[PDB]
Design a protein around this ligand. Sequence first.
Ligand SMILES: N[C@@H](CCC(=O)N[C@@H](CS)C(=O)NCC(=O)O)C(=O)O
Length: 100
Amino acid sequence: SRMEESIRKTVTENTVVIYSKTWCSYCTEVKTLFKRLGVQPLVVELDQLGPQGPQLQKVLERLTGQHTVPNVFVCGKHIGGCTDTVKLNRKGDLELMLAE
Ligand SMILES: N[C@@H](CCC(=O)N[C@@H](CS)C(=O)NCC(=O)O)C(=O)O
């Protein structure tokens, strides 16, 4: 699909991409973690896109294996959700990625 090719372009062009929903506490949490690191992520709020939201979500599951939000990409690579991102941070992998 065109939506799949567009996601690939979005995540290769933007250092941090968070596919989010505005009401989700885990999305807020991961937004805050990147803010504390000095990053300004690109946020895509899937609940604020009309019927494109659920279509995008389906393509995200095909690409990433995940059906929850947040769905986080760093340096073009899928990293997971909030707890995945927090674990990557706790290990210093997240900052090593950002540093390269
Ligand atoms: N363990 C996940 C949890 C994320 C989560 O539960 N997200 C909720 C929204 S706040 C969700 O996507 N729910 C949709 C569903 O369960 O299908 C993470 O750390 O990101």
